[PDB]
Design a protein around this ligand. Structure first.
Ligand SMILES: NC(=O)c1ccc[n+]([C@@H]2O[C@H](COP(=O)([O-])OP(=O)(O)OC[C@H]3O[C@@H](n4cnc5c(N)ncnc54)[C@H](O)[C@@H]3O)[C@@H](O)[C@H]2O)c1
Ligand SMILES: NC(=O)c1ccc[n+]([C@@H]2O[C@H](COP(=O)([O-])OP(=O)(O)OC[C@H]3O[C@@H](n4cnc5c(N)ncnc54)[C@H](O)[C@@H]3O)[C@@H](O)[C@H]2O)c1
Lengths: 254, 254
């Protein structure tokens, strides 16, 4: 994927990983960069515009917990305006195992719903051109942080969902791959709640081991986008980019 | 685990796999078998009761999508009657990828919430006796049926959650293991809805490959319960019982 002249929608572009990925994206000479996030951040918008005045950057308020119809309404308008969209990045996430329902709603259900919505405009069975989805999952979807079992389980769900999307690409025209950061220094991880307070010290302990910065993560994220490998399961950990091989424990044979 | 004289709560005990498992459980001379299901099944309830009239079988209507506090109220009623509960089996599930929110609510969120509720009675940090949780997940949580990506993702989530519960046993006193059936001739797999109708004939296709009987599955289910291995990931496929080894792609170090 040569990002030159492409149109990208990024859900949750303005958080820690999001914004460092966005900084790198706009260095690539996109035609349109459409940010969908819960709250507007004018400072970050100014920053992106200063990095590359050539990119047309637009913002829309978007909360992934809205019903699928509301996502369809917003996406319909963006597709109308732009005519085409090349890539959707689903980046929304929270880390708070005191918020069981909301963790699941944001990290799993919301991602599934934005995906379901955009298929209205991309699905080749409806006359669309197909497209590409990059889902921000997590290494915790491979192997949990067991002190945040709900968070980790929500990420295991979206790892699986993404794998399935990629296997459905011949039918829908929509390829997909997962972006799975290891521990990355952002507001997500500095202080957070463990399930039933099993480990009050969970952030302190987690951060006592090697990590990466959001800049490193963002750099490797855009490299993964540029590789453009349907079904890839990218690990972005300790400043490197690696594709992992999913174990075949079982096969449906369909 | 010697089931003799034990007290078991089984959520979703009278459906396809649940009922054969239930038949095998009550042959083992439980003291109490408490069934919590959304729908009454008098015929099924009568058969079970007749197998071993000595066993006390109690049914309570239970919807796993209710809030945690409602689950706690029901569990308090059961604990007040029984005083102790040895095993909780979480078996609720639907398969219908036209019902995205409800799939996630039943298959993932509800299992998490029933678990969260029973921890109030078992958590050793509050003076509880600990306990055992058997979660009915699915081989699809290892490798999806990609034509039902939402179902499969919900199952990946509960495989992960169960792994994490087991790792938390030192803290809570609550051991756990997953039971992961392969394709089993039962009715969930009768005619079902694929995500965005990518494959109208998933059931027909699944059954065009070797499968197992629900009798076979129930027999192996009870063997797994008797093995009582914290952190086991049991595959119940093609008539066998096998513990699988989870791939270590990443480690939190905590
Ligand atoms: N930081 C890490 O170590 C790490 C590791 C692996 C995966 N992740 C994932 O990366 C993604 C970004 O995390 P981050 O570390 O930058 O955290 P962050 O808190 O800085 O950013 C969270 C992002 O999600 C958005 N978001 C949250 N709730 C939303 C909602 N209801 N609707 C729309 N957007 C919403 C926020 O506005 C923000 O853009 C998340 O999916 C997170 O789970 C983080
Ligand atoms: N059948 C298979 O091939 C297969 C394979 C692997 C895993 N599973 C899992 O095994 C478990 C049982 O599957 P089955 O084949 O017996 O299907 P089934 O449809 O025959 O049984 C489903 C059970 O879940 C219960 N349930 C549904 N919604 C509920 C709710 N809201 N609250 C409480 N209970 C609810 C139903 O009452 C029923 O008892 C499910 O978790 C299923 O996902 C099935």
């Amino acid at each position: 994927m040569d990002l030159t002249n492409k149109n990208v929608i990024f859900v949750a572009a303005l958080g820690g990983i999001g914004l460092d990925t966005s900084r790198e994206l706009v260095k690539r000479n996109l035609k349109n960069f459409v940010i969908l996030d819960r709250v507007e951040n004018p400072t970050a918008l100014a920053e992106l515009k200063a990095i590359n005045p050539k990119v047309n950057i637009t913002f829309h308020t978007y909360d992934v917990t809205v019903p699928v119809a509301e996502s369809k309404k917003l996406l319909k308008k963006i597709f109308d305006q732009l005519k085409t969209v090349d890539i959707l990045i689903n980046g929304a996430g929270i880390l708070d195992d005191h918020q069981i329902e909301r963790t699941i709603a944001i990290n799993f259900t919301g991602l599934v719903n934005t995906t379901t919505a955009i298929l209205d405009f991309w699905d080749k069975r409806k006359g669309g051109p197909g497209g590409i989805i990059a889902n921000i999952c997590s290494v915790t979807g491979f192997n949990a942080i067991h002190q945040v079992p709900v968070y980790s389980a929500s990420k295991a769900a979206v790892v699986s969902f993404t794998n399935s999307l990629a296997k459905l690409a011949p039918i829908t025209g929509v390829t997909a791959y997962s972006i799975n950061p290891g521990i990355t220094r952002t507001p997500l991880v500095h202080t957070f709640n463990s399930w039933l307070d099993v480990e009050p010290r969970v952030a302190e302990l987690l951060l006592s081991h090697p990590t990466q910065t959001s800049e490193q993560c963002g750099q490797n994220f855009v490299k993964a986008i540029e590789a453009n490998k349907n079904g890839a399961i990218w690990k972005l950990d300790l400043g490197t980019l690696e594709a992992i091989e999913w174990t075949k424990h079982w096969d449906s044979h369909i």
